[PDB]
Amino acid sequence: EFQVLFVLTILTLISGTIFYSTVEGLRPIDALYFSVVTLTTVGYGDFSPQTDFGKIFTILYIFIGIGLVFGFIHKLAVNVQLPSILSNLV
Amino acid sequence: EFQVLFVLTILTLISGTIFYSTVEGLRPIDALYFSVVTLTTVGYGDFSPQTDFGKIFTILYIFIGIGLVFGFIHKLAVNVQLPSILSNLV
Amino acid sequence: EFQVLFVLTILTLISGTIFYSTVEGLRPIDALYFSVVTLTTVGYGDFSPQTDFGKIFTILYIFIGIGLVFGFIHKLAVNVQLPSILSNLV
Amino acid sequence: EFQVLFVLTILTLISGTIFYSTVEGLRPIDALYFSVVTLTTVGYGDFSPQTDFGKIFTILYIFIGIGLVFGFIHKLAVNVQLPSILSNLV
Ligand SMILES: [K+]
Ligand SMILES: [K+]
Ligand SMILES: [K+]
Ligand SMILES: [K+]
């Protein structure tokens, strides 16, 4: 469960990294950071797409990616972080 | 279920596209992108309303639109993406 | 239920409007718009607090306000928007 | 329950305060404010990391912190705010 969502999240972030590095000219690290900041809905806006291709991709990436990323966050919190916290209390 | 939320999401995004293109002077593609970035709560701020009409509309659009857009995202994730993922594992 | 959350949301937004208009010098309409953009987690950043008082208030306002605003949005979506949609289908 | 999430949220925010004050050169109050604005997903972008260290930390901080912060917000809303509201109605 967690492993599948972890792998899917990595793949989704790799896709954004490649897209934004190529089409929007970002350094790969900036493209990865931007992809994370986007799909977690933080949205600083220090980076944002300038091209119409980038804007269209971003629309679709948000709709397809938010569900996966927040599914991963939920499983991380409930199946990894929560048991680790409980274990520390004993 | 999914079809109804899909159609409602398209209609909601068309409404924002028309509003922001007219009142805020955005290109239609920018107005659509801004509407998506708003209702998914990303909020880059590369675009934001400059007129009081735009600010008032945005308040109401957020309150009326977030529930529909995140209902659609939830149904997309659970009723489309999840079964597709499970099918790939077999 | 819905009425109580509606009133609480209005009161919470009035509080932010008064605070940001006074301490951060915003026009009341801008303060209301900023309060909404904050508590719905959109966060354009076209407005943001410049004073330390404003930053401290914003921290506490977010933590106390997000739960109320998203409780209201949930009740709006499920108890008002959903039945209205279903009624249109018949 | 609430106490544990409260303490964990404080610890998580202290960690961000120390990190962003040191690596990104922010005043401690700005680092705390930025940490809150990040983990609640508001993301104004008035502050954002400029260094690659800061961007990498921010990616990991978001993934590890969102679950804790929104767990705390949920418990605050349902176990503290809700009973206080109900008590006011009698
Ligand atoms: K945001
Ligand atoms: K958000
Ligand atoms: K934002
Ligand atoms: K922003």
Residue numbers in the entry:
A (entry chain A), B (entry chain A), C (entry chain A), D (entry chain A): 23 to 112
What wording appears in the published article?
Using much shorter wavelength X-rays (0.97 Å), we were able to collect a dataset to atomic resolution (1.20 Å) for NaK2K, enabling us to reveal in unprecedented detail the protein structure of NaK2K. The overall protein structure of NaK2K remains similar to the previously reported structure (a RMSD of 0.28 Å for all Cα atoms). However, the increased resolution of our structure enabled us to visualize several unseen alternative conformations, such as Phe92, which has an important role in regulating the flow of ions through the selectivity filter. Within the asymmetric unit of the crystal are two identical polypeptide chains (A and B). When the fourfold symmetry of the I4 space group is applied, three additional symmetry-related molecules are generated to form an intact potassium ion channel from each of the two polypeptide chains in the asymmetric unit. In the A polypeptide chain, at the bottom of the selectivity filter on the intracellular side Phe92 is observed in a dual conformation, with the A conformation having a refined occupancy of 68% and the B conformation having a refined occupancy of 32%. In the B polypeptide chain within the unit cell, Phe92 is again in dual conformation, with a refined occupancy of 69% for the A conformation and 31% for the B conformation. The A conformation (68% occupancy) corresponds to an enlarged pore conformation of the ion channel in its open form while the B conformation (32% occupancy) corresponds to a restricted form of the open form of the ion channel. Thus, the dual conformations of Phe92 observed in our structure indicate that in the open form of NaK2K, which is caused by the deletion of the interfacial helix, the two conformations of Phe92 co-occur; one is a restricted pore form which limits ion conductance while the other is an enlarged pore form which is more conducive to ion permeation.
The introduction of Asp66Tyr and Asn68Asp mutations in the NaK amino acid sequence causes main-chain conformational changes of the GYG residues in the selectivity filter. This double NaK mutant named NaK2K possesses the conserved amino sequence (TVGYG) found in all potassium ion channels. The NaK channel shares a high amino acid sequence homology and a similar structure with the bacterial KcsA potassium ion channel from S. lividans, but its selectivity filter adopts a different conformation. Both NaK and KcsA are tetrameric ion channels composed of four identical polypeptide chains which form a symmetrical structure. The selectivity filter displays a high selectivity for potassium ions over sodium ions and is formed from four contiguous and chemically equivalent binding sites.
